[PDB]
Each structure stands twice: as structure tokens, then as C-alpha cells.
Design a protein around this ligand. Structure first.
Ligand SMILES: NC[C@@H]1O[C@H](O[C@H]2[C@@H](O)[C@H](O[C@@H]3[C@@H](O)[C@H](N)C[C@H](N)[C@H]3O[C@H]3O[C@H](CN)[C@@H](OP(=O)(O)OC[C@H]4O[C@@H](n5cnc6c(N)ncnc65)[C@H](O)[C@@H]4O)[C@H](O)[C@H]3N)O[C@@H]2CO)[C@H](N)[C@@H](O)[C@@H]1O
Ligand SMILES: NC[C@@H]1O[C@H](O[C@H]2[C@@H](O)[C@H](O[C@@H]3[C@@H](O)[C@H](N)C[C@H](N)[C@H]3O[C@H]3O[C@H](CN)[C@@H](OP(=O)(O)OC[C@H]4O[C@@H](n5cnc6c(N)ncnc65)[C@H](O)[C@@H]4O)[C@H](O)[C@H]3N)O[C@@H]2CO)[C@H](N)[C@@H](O)[C@@H]1O
Ligand SMILES: [Mg+2]
Ligand SMILES: [Mg+2]
Ligand SMILES: [Mg+2]
Ligand SMILES: [Mg+2]
Lengths: 252, 252
């Protein structure tokens, strides 16, 4: 019934059982096996799960095995070296949430320093990619969110405002992480680490304190905190040179 | 800045200006042009944006133009017929959130009934795809969320509980939408439409009204409501046959 409590040593025993199954099934096509997530960081809790990544020599390989035993859960990703390195150098809007997995890999099997290659690739991403992701985030996510809460103020529904506020605070956290080109430790610590960073957009800290405390019932204060954060954004982007093109009416 | 107030008539003027550029640039490679989102449903609000889809004849075409003028925002997706039809028949975990776009397309240009083809494809998916997506959702998301809030109870951080509770309520809404094979109208109405459907898992209704009202500060009331919803999941999946074999420790 649900995830049960497990200690670190029992989880690692499962990891090596899976590693032996992987090597028995795929043999010399396995280049490397590593553990990421909290278990790879050696900070797994009693109810933490298991996340493993495998580097294959197998040409264009990209698949995953994700299952439960009813008591615990495992996910194993299988990728070719080319596919994995390409993904590790691609900066999407949620890069600060996702790509921390490449910075604390616990090696389990490695025939040729592949896990070190993935780490070097992830930490050497060209600065321009973060600049482009920040500008895309403002247009694709933040500008759209602003239209949604401004609609809520004039026509509702207020029952969406708590969920929307959570999404906006998360998007702002991604914006800060992209600026500092720093990945957050884990999903549970995204907002906690975001508000402790420097160069915050004005109004972001105040907005986060609603989400972190759970006080999301005052719709008129939420709308005002969102509006203050939005105004802070375009300040913030012109100070750091993240300028968005608003000049073309049809840009194709 | 942000999105300004616009009327429906101003939005439709922009749509026909964009369609007119599309035909000039791509000519006979344009199979169809349609409007989706709230404008395609003719329920756009004062701050709503513009969402358009374009079916191309050029095989493997898949690109998008998404921009702002500082005052309003537009997104135009360009897809080949095969890529679009394939996507319209694939049932992911967020299918109830995304695939409503194929059920209320406002036609603007159609050289061969392609927009009707996309609609028929979207509504003619065999039930097995929804059964598999429901089972995948429980393993990949709900079981994982249960481990995360159980970690919060024993080790924190409690500041993540409001955001996690919102994610669980959304995942439950996807679960209900997949069961009934009905997509939600828009993101703002996901929770409102989810709790009005029949055959809900026990405890989901109570959990949603925490999220819909914004009262997410009582951490222990949230944790108990989450556990009740999780218990409701097990009876609900048991009763409807969304069962996966969980007996093997490594099922590959
Ligand atoms: N593998 C290389 C590369 O991966 C790409 O795919 C992405 C992404 O699409 C995929 O997400 C998976 C979903 O597609 C699938 N439906 C369910 C899986 N559970 C998803 O896995 C990822 O998301 C969960 C989130 N619960 C991660 O588990 P966890 O919370 O325990 O976190 C462990 C560590 O992983 C990082 N992290 C945290 N949150 C996320 C999210 N939301 N996405 C991705 N990574 C996250 C964080 O550092 C944390 O410490 C799970 O580990 C994670 N794998 O996952 C991969 C990227 O990993 C493409 N398939 C392709 O380009 C190529 O294969
Ligand atoms: N086009 C065929 C197919 O699309 C696939 O791509 C997906 C998905 O990856 C993509 O999401 C876009 C992001 O990748 C991009 N970074 C930013 C874009 N803004 C995203 O567009 C989609 O998400 C927004 C969410 N705000 C949608 O806008 P909106 O709130 O105005 O909603 C309009 C209508 O669209 C439906 N809807 C609602 N929420 C969503 C979300 N989260 N995703 C997708 N659709 C949503 C709903 O019915 C509502 O009435 C935006 O319209 C939407 N396009 O978008 C497409 C899926 O549409 C692949 N690229 C590929 O398989 C192929 O191209
Ligand atoms: Mg984990
Ligand atoms: Mg995991
Ligand atoms: Mg819209
Ligand atoms: Mg839109």
C-alpha cells in the first residue's frame, strides 16, 4: 500500500540487482550505468524512489523502464551517448528543475569515463542558450500567465487563482535559475533555493511567500502580488539584457 | 506592458491577417488553417490570446511561430498531416488537458476536409489507449507523488506541500478525464469540471476544494486528505480493472 519506508542500504541493494539484470540482458552494449536523484546525492529519505540512467552504445537507442512492486518504484532510462549528450546541452524553460541530474551522478558501471563526459557537457553549456531560454520563457509562459490572471480579475474563475499562482512562482524560479545558470537540488527545494538567490526580480519574494506558506485564499492580494511581480519582470530583463523582440507584427 | 484588452473582432482581424501571410509564404503547401483555444470556441475573454494551427503538405514539417507585440501574443503551429494526425491519436497523461484543441476548431482554410479528418481521428481512439495511459499515470505520477508527500511528513520541507498538493489535484483531474474520455475546456476550468464528473475516486472531491479555495496552510489536514485520496485510488483502480502486475522485482 503506497511507497513503504526503505533505508539507503536496501535501495542500493536493489540498484545492484538491477545493474546485474541490465548487464545480463544487454551485455557489451552497456557503456555506463549511474544513479541520480536523491539516492545518487546520498540524501534519499525513507520514502524516496530509485532513478538510474544507462548509457548505451546502441545506435539511436532511447527507451525507459518504469515500474512499481507495490512497495517501491524504479525508473531506468536508456539512451545512446549521442542522444544523452544532446539532451544534456539543451536548455529548455525547466532546465533548472531537470538538469541537476547530471551534476551528482553516482557511478555504478563505466567502461570509458562516459559519466564524466555527461557531467562536463552539462556544466559547459554555452551562455547564449540560457539567454534564449529566458526570452522564450517570458513570451511563452509569463506573458500567457499574465493574460490568464488578468482574465480572472475581470471574469473569473477565482478557483483557478491558487493553482495559477503556483505555476507563476515556479516559472519565476526557472527564470532565476536560468539567469544564474544553476540547477536546483530537487523539486521540493526549488522555491526555497530560488528566494535565496541574488538579483531577484522585484515582487518575486513576496509572491513566493504565499505559495510556500499555503496562504492562497485572498484573491485580491494574490492578483496584486502577481501584477507587482509582472512589472518587476520587465525592469528585470532590461537590466540584464534579456530583451524581447516586440517589433514585428507577423514575424515570419 | 502585459496583454491589453482586446475584443473578439480585433482578434479575428489579426487571424485573417496571419492566414493571409501564411498563404503568401507557403502557397499550395498549406492544406488547412484553423483557430483553436478560446477564440476558436468564440469564448475568448478581454485578456485572451490567439492560437492557430496549420496543416502542411510538406512531409515532416513541424515548427511553430510564437511571438508578442508587447501588447498581445500569438502562437501558430505548423505540422504535416501525418505528424498532426499521429499526435491527435496519442493518449498521454495530460490528454484531458491538451487534446480539447481538436474538438472545437474554427475553420478558416481547408483545401480537402483536413480539419474534419483531425477531429474524427481525435474522437476515434480505441479505449485500450486510455486504459494504458491510466495505468501509466498511476505508476509514473501518483505513486511518485505519494512518496514525496510522505517524505514531507517525516522530513520536510513543508513549504513544498502546497505546490505538491496542486500537482496531485491536477493529476487526479487527468485520471478522471482519461476514464471518461473527455477533455477539459481550458486550463482554468480543469478542477471545476473534474469534480462534477461521476465515478470519482473517494477523497478526490475533498482534496480539490483545498486547492480550489486556496486553503493550503494546514499541512496536516492536507497530508490526511492526500492519504485519503490515495486510498480512494486503490479501490477505484481495483473496481475498474486498471491493474498492473506488480509481483516481479525487475519486470524486464
Ligand atoms: N534521458 C535523456 C533524455 O530524457 C528525455 O525525457 C526526459 C523527461 O521527458 C522525462 O520525464 C519523464 C516522463 O516523460 C515520464 N512520463 C515519467 C517519468 N517519471 C519522467 O522522469 C523524470 O521526471 C520525474 C519526476 N518525478 C523524475 O523523478 P524524480 O522527482 O525522482 O527526480 C529525480 C531527479 O531528476 C530531476 N528531475 C526532477 N524533476 C524532474 C522532471 N519533472 N523532469 C525531469 N527531471 C526531473 C532532478 O534532478 C531530480 O533530482 C525522473 O527522475 C525524471 N527522469 O525524464 C527525462 C529526463 O530525465 C527524453 N526521453 C529524451 O530527450 C532523452 O531520453
Ligand atoms: N501541434 C501538434 C503537435 O504539438 C506537440 O507540441 C505540443 C506541446 O509540446 C506544445 O506545447 C507548447 C510548448 O512546447 C511551448 N514551449 C510553448 C507553447 N505555448 C505550448 O503550446 C501549448 O501550451 C499552451 C499552454 N498555455 C497552449 O495555450 P493556451 O492556454 O492558450 O490553451 C489553448 C488551447 O490549447 C489546449 N491546451 C491547454 N493547455 C495546454 C498545454 N499545457 N499544452 C498543450 N495544449 C494545451 C486547450 O485545449 C486550450 O483550449 C497552447 O495552445 C499549446 N499549443 O503544444 C503542442 C500541443 O498543442 C508537438 N510539437 C508535436 O507532436 C506536434 O507539433
Ligand atoms: Mg527520486
Ligand atoms: Mg523518480
Ligand atoms: Mg488561449
Ligand atoms: Mg495561448
Amino acid at each position: 500500500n503506497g511507497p513503504i519506508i526503505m533505508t539507503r542500504e536496501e535501495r542500493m541493494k536493489i540498484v545492484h540487482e538491477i545493474k546485474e539484470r541490465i548487464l545480463d540482458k544487454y551485455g557489451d552494449d552497456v557503456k555506463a550505468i549511474g544513479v541520480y536523484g536523491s539516492l545518487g546525492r546520498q540524501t534519499d529519505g525513507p520514502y524516496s524512489d530509485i532513478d538510474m540512467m544507462c548509457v548505451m552504445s546502441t545506435e539511436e537507442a532511447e527507451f525507459s523502464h518504469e515500474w512499481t512492486t507495490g512497495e517501491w518504484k524504479v525508473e531506468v532510462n536508456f539512451d545512446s551517448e549521442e542522444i544523452l549528450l544532446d539532451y544534456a546541452s539543451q536548455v529548455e524553460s525547466d532546465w533548472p528543475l531537470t538538469h541537476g541530474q547530471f551534476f551528482s551522478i553516482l557511478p555504478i558501471y563505466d567502461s570509458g569515463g562516459y559519466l564524466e563526459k555527461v557531467y562536463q557537457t552539462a556544466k559547459s553549456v554555452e551562455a547564449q542558450k540560457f539567454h534564449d531560454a529566458i526570452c522564450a520563457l517570458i513570451v511563452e509562459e509569463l506573458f500567457e500567465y499574465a493574460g490568464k490572471w488578468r482574465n480572472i480579475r475581470v471574469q473569473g474563475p477565482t478557483t483557478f487563482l491558487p493553482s495559477l499562482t503556483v505555476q507563476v512562482a515556479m516559472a519565476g524560479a526557472m527564470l532565476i535559475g536560468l539567469h544564474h545558470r544553476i540547477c536546483y537540488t530537487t523539486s521540493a527545494s526549488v522555491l526555497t533555493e530560488a528566494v535565496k538567490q541574488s538579483d531577484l526580480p522585484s515582487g518575486y519574494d513576496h509572491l513566493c511567500q504565499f505559495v510556500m506558506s499555503g496562504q492562497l485564499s485572498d484573491s485580491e492580494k494574490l492578483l496584486e502580488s502577481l501584477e507587482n511581480f509582472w512589472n518587476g519582470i520587465q525592469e528585470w530583463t532590461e537590466r540584464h539584457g534579456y530583451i524581447v523582440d516586440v517589433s514585428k507584427r507577423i514575424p515570419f
